[PDB]
Subunit: 448 residues, 4 copies
Amino acid sequence: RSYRFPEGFLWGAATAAYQIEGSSMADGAGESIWDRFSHTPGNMKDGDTGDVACDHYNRWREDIELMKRLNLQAYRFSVSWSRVIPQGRGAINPKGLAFYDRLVDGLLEAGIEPLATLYHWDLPAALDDRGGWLNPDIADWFADYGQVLFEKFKGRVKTWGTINEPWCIVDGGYLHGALAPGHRSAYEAVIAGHNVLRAHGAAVRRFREVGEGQIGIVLNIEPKYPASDKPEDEAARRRAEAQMNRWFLDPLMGRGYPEELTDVYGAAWREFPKEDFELIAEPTDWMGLNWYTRAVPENAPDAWPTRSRPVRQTQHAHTETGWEVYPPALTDTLVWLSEQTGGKLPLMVTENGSAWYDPPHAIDGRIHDPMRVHYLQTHIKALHDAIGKGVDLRGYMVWSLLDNLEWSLGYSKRFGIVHVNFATQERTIKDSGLFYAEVIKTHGDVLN
Amino acid sequence: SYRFPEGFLWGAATAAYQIEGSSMADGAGESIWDRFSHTPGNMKDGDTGDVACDHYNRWREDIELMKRLNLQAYRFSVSWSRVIPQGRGAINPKGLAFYDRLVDGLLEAGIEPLATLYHWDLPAALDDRGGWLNPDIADWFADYGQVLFEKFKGRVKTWGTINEPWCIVDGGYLHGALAPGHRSAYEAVIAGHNVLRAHGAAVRRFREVGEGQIGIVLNIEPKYPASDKPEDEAARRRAEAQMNRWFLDPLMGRGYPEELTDVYGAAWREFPKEDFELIAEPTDWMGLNWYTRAVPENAPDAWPTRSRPVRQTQHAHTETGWEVYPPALTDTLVWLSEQTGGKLPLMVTENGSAWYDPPHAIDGRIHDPMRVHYLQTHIKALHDAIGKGVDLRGYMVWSLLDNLEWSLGYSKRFGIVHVNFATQERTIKDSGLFYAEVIKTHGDVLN
Amino acid sequence: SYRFPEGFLWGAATAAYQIEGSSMADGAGESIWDRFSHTPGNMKDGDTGDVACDHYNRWREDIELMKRLNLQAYRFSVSWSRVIPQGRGAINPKGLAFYDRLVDGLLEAGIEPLATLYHWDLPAALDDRGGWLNPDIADWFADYGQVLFEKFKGRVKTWGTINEPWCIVDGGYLHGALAPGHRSAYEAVIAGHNVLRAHGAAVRRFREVGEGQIGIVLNIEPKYPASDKPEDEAARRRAEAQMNRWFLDPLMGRGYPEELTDVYGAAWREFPKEDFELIAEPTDWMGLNWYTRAVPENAPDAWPTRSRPVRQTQHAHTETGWEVYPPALTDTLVWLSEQTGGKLPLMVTENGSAWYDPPHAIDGRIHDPMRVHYLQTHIKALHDAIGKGVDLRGYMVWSLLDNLEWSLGYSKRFGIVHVNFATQERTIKDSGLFYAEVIKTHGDVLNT
Amino acid sequence: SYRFPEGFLWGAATAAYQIEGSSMADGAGESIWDRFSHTPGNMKDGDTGDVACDHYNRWREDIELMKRLNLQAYRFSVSWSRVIPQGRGAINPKGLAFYDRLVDGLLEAGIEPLATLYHWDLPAALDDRGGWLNPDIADWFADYGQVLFEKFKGRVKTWGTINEPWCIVDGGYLHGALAPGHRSAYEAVIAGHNVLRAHGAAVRRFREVGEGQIGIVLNIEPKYPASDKPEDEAARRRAEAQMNRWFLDPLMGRGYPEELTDVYGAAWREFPKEDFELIAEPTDWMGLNWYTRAVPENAPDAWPTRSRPVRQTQHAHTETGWEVYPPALTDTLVWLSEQTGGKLPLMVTENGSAWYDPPHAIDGRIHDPMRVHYLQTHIKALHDAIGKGVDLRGYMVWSLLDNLEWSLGYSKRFGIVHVNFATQERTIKDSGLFYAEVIKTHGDVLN
Ligand SMILES: OC[C@H]1O[C@@H](O)[C@H](O)[C@@H](O)[C@@H]1O
Ligand SMILES: OC[C@H]1O[C@@H](O)[C@H](O)[C@@H](O)[C@@H]1O
Ligand SMILES: OC[C@H]1O[C@@H](O)[C@H](O)[C@@H](O)[C@@H]1O
Ligand SMILES: OC[C@H]1O[C@@H](O)[C@H](O)[C@@H](O)[C@@H]1O
């Protein structure tokens, strides 16, 4: 059984700005919604903030050396909007942009392909005071922001992500309020989802106008499996699936919004002008999939708003985030996604990984995380299985390069293949990282 | 004796979303409360303002009720989104026509219309543009004000701009118990500033295109000492600054309270010099909303004022949990008279109490002796305040009707007229009958 | 007319721990409520019965208030631990002397003393031996009963054994909202059984050494249909069985309700037959405590009866959240008459309502029109019940005094006499003033 | 070097309700955990001990597992309700026959049986008589003890009376998180006293009819300073007194800690002198159950010790939220040696850690590196304690099997042998393998 991956298959690791950078108000950088959110009592586990995080803003060179040691061929990262344009619109912050300039040059020097994401949940607070994702004008704002980077890194950054996980942004930020900006409203949720899609489309158009290379959106998908043969449970499954997995993909593929949403959001649902949908379906060059687990939803009449709830799959191992470990569902998702996009759209797993308990410090220079290693090997094999079934998969990015701030869950959830001691900023490569380095090095042959 | 000054104006007060119903009828736009009340968990028993008192349909009956109560003034608010569905742009003819009919009808009955521009029901379309976090609202509001100023020129002579900035910001942006349901000190500071600016802009617009008298309406809750411990006094001043001085001081041209720098910490901001010039734009009158006092003590974990009220078990409490203590009204009025230098005519735009009443009348009656008591003792307290030199021009009872007490739903009844929400049947309570006699005798019944 | 039958006895009721105070005074022992009320979280506002109405010291004043109210009867309870500090053994002379003086004072006033042996205040020493879970309590109780039976032989002629077995067991052992604060269906079943046995043993002992009439006091909350749906009728029957028939049926020699097997499942037990012979020991009268009705519907997650009341929003509710609905009193009396075969003399030993009153009088008055309304409508309902052939001999208002409403503390005022708990000053409410007229006119005032 | 003293006994520990299952099978009576676990809300995920590890049926397999681990001792508890169904009266032949078979099987395997009389599973019939609140239990327990003492005379030579009085009382009577689920300080004080008395009575009875060595087993959680704040030191001493000195002190003839008067307030009681004579009956050995330390700070609303632990984020924490800090073991042992005058032979009857393991093996393996780390560091800490003169005779790993962690259910795995609760399949973890090597080399594997 060979597990050699196709020629040119790109191996890498991923991060996000607010989760690792720190130095949030340094060198002209503006205030973001997460600056506000994390400094409001009760919002974050243990009162954790992104003020320091992995201190990546200061230690990025060391982190690049770590990327070299892991044999990374790509590094997926996001750019902080508020660091580059403090008020979201208007004046550019020279120092802030200069950081990412140095970073990208350093990556290219090391032979690492820089994969940049425009928006990873950190909207400028100044734009939030103008309504944030509820204001349609954001489609323009985002575009302008996108342009600034497109021209600045022309020929250096060739592969672009627009939005990272619209569902997390809207469902967490506007529907239930567990994430910044912390709103709880179905009305706002539908409007926000629509404007996130529109902003993506606008950014793609602007990219056609001034940019060079390939651009696409990044979706998280959590495949919904049957709980039973009861029709109410199938209705539950379809509601959950529609709200989470089809909400954004369908209009991006020109299929409009899922019918089930009319039922999920009820009186909060809206009909939008057709030209919005033409803008939203603006053709992309590639698509990123963020994948971690599956769910098995059953009917739940009091669960707002999808009226569904996951059934705990006690037959399998679970991560520290409470996610079932089940690799075949990755293969299934990749096939499903290939079908939804017609096989015409190049795909990349832009995020995959797992959180398990690690001690806060290295133990004799080591971190032994056997379950993370297991997750890594089984899911990469599942990737190979997906390619064997004809899915056009071009690459794989491990979430995450570093133990970092897992947003509202703080530092308690470690996703890194590199351990970070948050007291000393000391980095220690985990057994999972060592293994991943070997997987890259053998181009998959180590799995045989 | 308790006879009141000549020309002293007696009335009752309401607000649009709390009584109107028909929130989406006849072109009416969606407001932030339409959204808020239809989100599960926000409202007690899942109550909404969809029907309320059905006043949009029964306003004539309600006016006849005003006549039975001998009212000389009626304080009400205009729903911004009913008049301007998108907050800016096209006027909604029927929505404006409702208030046209209402005001004309009031004038026919000899009742003075006291109009409030904003009573917490922001158009949702403006909320999607940031609401009170967007400085442009100062202009938006002004334009809205103009529409009314010109429409009711010569008919509505007494105007309120904003009703209770503190409730709007503290409830709506700081703690999130009210629409639009945000919870942020940063947003609270910005929103408070833009509320004050909006008031100023509306007053300027009124100077250019309006006719009559214009002013803001503040709620004040006097903070009394819990002890002689210094940390408790510091607590008292934090609470007082955050609730009672936050808006009054910049309105009187004295800037923001120093204590706010301590209350909001990193969320506090410095604002441009000209903003305070706009905010202190001279007004003609001021409204006071008053219900109770508080006795704050130090509470380090209470965010963000680090203070909390001490339950005053020696006195009666309302169904909203507010201490019954009329002397604090007198004091407050005096205090207010002093903060505004005595030059600014004051009016009690809201005062009243919530007690349990049955959901239906009992042989054509509702017996509410505690509400009657609250009424008589606090009106006497008004007389005492006038005796100490306060230029107090009138008194409006909250409320004319049992209505939607926002997030607390219909469970909190403030009306001097009972509303059976099953049948929309109105029954005048004993408090209403008594209030009618207080008006007719111009206070002599209190002797 | 609303004139009541000849000899119809009007009175008012209290309980020891709710009014007395002086819980550890003059040799008095520790009760389960002494412990319970001084455990944080158990009582609203941290209220205790340490002082209450200070009745232990102000009983003479309270008797003068009874005369002013024209009371013909005063129903009160005797604190077991005040009379027998350890529950068994040595008698406390001063403690017993209190009730001696009280009873003599009542007789001096021309007031019928109505004594209750047990009103929820078990001696802590007996609770340490298992309390109502220990079958030997049937004997302990009997012995305690004997002490009183002999002491007031010829003075107290009408005796209550247990006040509301359902509240004792459901509140004290099933859900833990009342002392001793256990939460167990197993314990609930056993405790209910032993409470019934204790009642029987006490009645037998009364036959051996006592004089007059003896009976139990049950509270009943009639369960009305929420719908004609069979699941709701089954729910109604479960609730009715657990609350209204659990104790009445074995007392009438009918055994335990079948539905209990379904309600309690694995916690249900079969008991020896002679136990049921003991439980059905013939009594002379029965007390009904009545306040409201319920309208139960099916509720699969409601433990353990799988039912829940539907809020009857068309009617007024008290501050304890109880629907005001007088016809249900009439129905209940009829029902009870039918269950007891018409052969057992009935008395309403508790009826009343809680509404907000200020903490102090207002120029010498307390105006409680809703309590007055409750009083007049429910007394009229009694007349209706007598008109339907129910053998009703009397009516006791709960309560004579504002007192400690157990776990709900002093916030719930049931008194027709207001108590300022800051000053212990008594002020007769409008309800008391009206009730005095009801007694005086023997019901004729309800006409005019 | 880490070679241990000659005769140092290596073993592993379990408890009856946590592993046996078949709780009311073969004549066995109902225990308080039978009731408690089958009452909704009491147990995580609704887990019960109905099946557990099915040890009642699979004990032979488990003994083969003990042999593969090179165990020299197996510490287990006897279910009171399995042996005497009503707690008093008739013996249950089958229930006793199980432990007879078990003990013979262990002796046959060359494994020293260490028996515990009470590990939290009081017979329900005795709970209906007041349980640990009824002083008569001192006698009941004694009788129960006698039954075992005589049945296993010459076979079971090392006896434990009570396992962790503090958990029994604090969990079962003070806070109500454990069976019998009471929450009362009054009851907590009484129950603690009667547990101590029961221990004494059992020791006396053992002197009359038993053979071998008898002792109690205490859990100790050493309390370290959170700060130099005096309120925090007072907090530390309250917590220390309530948890670590409550039982040890009267066992050593020093009476109850003074601080308890402050902790329990009005619930505290004075007891007869002869009670303390009974409680201090001389024992032959003492068991220490040890897992972690705590760092308490002042907490006025924390009932009743008014203290709370400060999270030590510089160190690793187990899945039960317990800090991993091996030196505190060494210190504790020394402290215990000092409190007992160095004259009383000590044994660590429980030490171990809970980390996440998958519910099934991979592949026929369970890799638990943190449990291995915990094991090596704490065993080294034992060696350090022995080097300082502590008379430590043995070490028992908690636990032999993944089992029911009481109210936290099966989610907390303490086993050095993994149990697949779907299939009852046992798989020796890396920790078990390593421990087997530690026993074999008598410590030399550590170096
Ligand atoms: O929750 C784990 C991860 O989920 C990903 O899909 C998000 O992009 C990350 O920001 C987050 O850390
Ligand atoms: O809480 C009672 C009343 O308080 C007033 O100050 C507000 O303006 C009303 O909207 C509210 O119903
Ligand atoms: O719930 C109010 C009243 O209910 C009666 O059934 C109880 O016997 C009283 O003790 C209690 O005060
Ligand atoms: O909490 C983990 C362990 O703690 C020990 O002290 C108890 O004796 C065990 O029964 C329990 O499983």
